[model samples]
Target: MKNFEIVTVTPDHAEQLISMIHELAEFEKMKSSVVNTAEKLRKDIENKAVHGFIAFIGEEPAGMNLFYYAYSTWVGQYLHMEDLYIRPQFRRMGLARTLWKKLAELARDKGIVRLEWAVLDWNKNAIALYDTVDYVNLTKSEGWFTFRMDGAAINKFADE
Candidate 1:
């Protein structure tokens, strides 16, 4: 963490971002589910549909956090952190906590009422980190489960 810096991700970093995303998928043992590309990432950044930051340690990309703005009827604006990943070698350097703190600062500055993210059930390390930061686990506390519909399922539902 000594030689680290956090920089906002731009269109020029799309390829690097895509690479890190794939690395994260591989770490999570779900590489087959990763279908994102630099082109798609570039488009999202260009359209302001998503925002992200990358962490660098002496010129090496060490970690990243991607997020987007969302609205909640009950609480107005919030930030949804879609992905947060740090390379295995960089796991305990305080980069993740620093990145999260930066995001929290942004949320406070923008009047965001909440910052939200989802972690896989098996990722106990991540869950523990969130717990240490006092983040509420909605699944455990409120009995909420994440549901998704995509790919062929989307078409199937649309036809119904």
Candidate 2:
């Protein structure tokens, strides 16, 4: 097993992180949905919308997890884990787990009260992994739902 290190990603690492983000999209079966370019990713990290953490296997980038801060009236503050990706060749090396642990610590250090993330319904392995790390499997019993006003929707709403 190769040893790895985790570090916060800066704007200079945006291009590589964008590549990893696309790989994550493909892994999540939404390859066609990634519309971010490296330039856009650069701007996003700088603007603080997409905070990133990268895992390195020796000297090369091996995995990454990106997130944004979210607030819920119920939880106060939370870390929204968005894209967590370990390169195909780097699986089983514990790099992914390392990244996840670091994220938990990061959330704690930032005074976040909760760490919330959504997983695809079909990915049982991921769900189990999260469970082992003591994350609850929240049910969708709440009457409320999630809606994103992005891209065309955001533009249309902005024009209103």
Candidate 3:
């Protein structure tokens, strides 16, 4: 907890951000799927296309939170938290909890109506942490009328 600093991901932090992003992807068993290069990250960050925060402990990179804005035709603007990654050695230090709070503060300041995200099945989305964000898990047992269109479906529908 000591010497830990969490700050917005500046353009200077793009390289560090991408490295941690790959680290997270590797843990989630999708390392090879991360085609996001640091250059693209830097560009998107500068253009405000994406945003994130890097956690540093005494100048050593420890964790990061990557996210972006999303719009829903029915619900208006929300934030999609793409990832909340902490290094293996850095776990159990309350970093994720702190980063989660930071995002809430961000939404409050920016007037973002909701902060959204997804988790792998039976993954570690606990009630304790979500209490901070008022998180919801819209499981099928507790269904809602939401839908998605992946690339293929979107393309097929586009020509229709």
Candidate 4:
């Protein structure tokens, strides 16, 4: 395994991070859904509304895990991982787990009660990795279903 280092992302990393985020969107077949720009990323990071880390393998960007703080009444504070991905050539080298482990450490250090992330059901490899890390599948374990409202829906409700 190659020695890797994690870098806390800041506004200075907006371009690189946004590029990786677009790559992730492409991988998930949701490229069109990506409305984010480097400008937006810079603003969010500068505003402290978003946080994440980038992993580098000897100076080459290997992967990233973007996340945010969230509150769960049932579980107190937690970290909600918005994205976790490794470059294709970087996969299977345990880099993914390394990134996740770092995030877990961050959560623990911050007194976060839990670390949460949503994985697509069809992503068997990711699911297996989560299981290997002992992360429970809330949907299966507790019958939890994720819901979202944004864009047109938000506008419709605002006009109501």
What residue pairs are clashing in model 2? none
Q: What is the lDDT of residue 11 in candidate 3?
A: 86
What C-alpha lDDT do the candidate models reach, one value each?
0.85, 0.80, 0.81, 0.86
For candidate 3, report its TM-score. Answer: 0.82
* Candidates 1 and 2, the one with greater lDDT: 1
What TM-score, computed on C-alpha atoms, does each candidate reach?
0.92, 0.86, 0.82, 0.93
Per-residue lDDT of candidate 4, residues 7-47 (tens digit): 99989888878888878777778778877799999999999
Candidate 3: stretches off by over 4 Å? 125-128, 131-133, 141-160
Model 4, which residues run further than 4 Å from truth? none
Local lDDT at 27 for model 3: 68
**Across residues 1-160, which tens digit of lDDT does each residue of candidate 2 receive?**
5568788989999978877877777666667876789999888899887887898877788889888988888878788888777899987666767788888999778888788888878888677667667666565655546677768987888889
TM-score of 2: 0.86
- Model 3 lDDT-worst window of ten: 122-131
